[PDB]
Amino acid sequence: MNLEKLEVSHDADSLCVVIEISKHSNIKYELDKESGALMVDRVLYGAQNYPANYGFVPNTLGSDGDPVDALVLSDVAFQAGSVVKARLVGVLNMEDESGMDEKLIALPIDKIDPTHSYVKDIDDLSKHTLDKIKHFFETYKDLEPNKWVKVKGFENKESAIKVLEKAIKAYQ
C-alpha cells in the first residue's frame, strides 16, 4: 500500500489503524513505510498467539521511534495489511527493554461491527479479557534473549486520548 496517500483519521472515536497482526496469529508482521510491504518481523518463540488484532496508528510518533501501537479487540481477525477505523476505549501502559511503549486499546467503529458497541470505556471489558491481554504482553518475550517487558496496567479512554494527541504532535 501507500500510507502516504491514505486519509488518516485521528478522532478518538474514528481512529485510522493499520493492522500488522491478525488476532490469533503468532506471526508478527511489520509494514515497511517505503515499500509498503509486510515484513515478517518475528515468530512467537513460545506457544502463544495475539489476543486481538495489533497494528499501529498512521502519522503519529510516540516514545519508541515508531507510531503509537494499537489493539482492535474484536471477534474476527482482520487480514494483516488491511486498514480499520477504531475508537479509543483505553490503553495498556508498559515499559520494556527499550523503554515506554504504551498500547492503545480499541474497537472498530460500530458501523463496521456493532458487536461490542456497549464497551464505551476500559472498565467495560471483561476481567478475563484484560488479564489475558496483560499476561500475554508480560510473557510473550520470555524466551527472547535480551528482551523483557514490564506491564504497568490499563487506563481509561481519557488517558489514552491524551497519549494519542501526545504522539500526534510529536509526529510533525
Q: What is the dihedral of CA 75, 163, 59, 140, to 10 degrees?
A: -50
**107, β-bridge pairs:** 87
Q: Extract the C-alpha cell encoding 98.
A: 527499550
Name the one residue in this structure whose C-alpha cell is 456493532.
114
The reply on whether position 36 binds a second copy by CB under 8 A is no
54 is in an annotated binding site: yes
CB 91 within 8 A of CB 62: no
Q: Specify the residue, 113 or 144, whose C-beta has the smaller distance to a second copy.
A: 144
Q: Specify the residue, 41 or 123, whose C-beta has the smaller distance to a second copy.
A: 123
Q: Specify the residue, 59 or 93, whose C-beta has the smaller distance to a second copy.
A: 93
The reply on whether position 162 binds a second copy by CB under 8 A is yes
**95, β-bridge pairs:** 100, 150
The reply on whether position 33 binds a second copy by CB under 8 A is no
The reply on whether position 132 binds a second copy by CB under 8 A is yes
Residue 2 CA: distances (Å) to CA of 31, 35, 84, 90, 94: 11, 8, 15, 28, 30
Q: Extract the C-alpha cell encoding 68.
A: 503509537
The reply on whether position 111 binds a second copy by CB under 8 A is no
Feature table: binding site: 28, 42, 54, 64, 69, 101, 140
Annotated binding site for substrate: 28, 42, 54, 140
Report the interface residues with a second copy, using CB under 8 A: 45-51, 93, 95, 97, 99-100, 123, 127-128, 131-133, 135-136, 139-140, 142-143, 145-146, 148, 150, 152-153, 155-156, 158-159, 162-163, 166
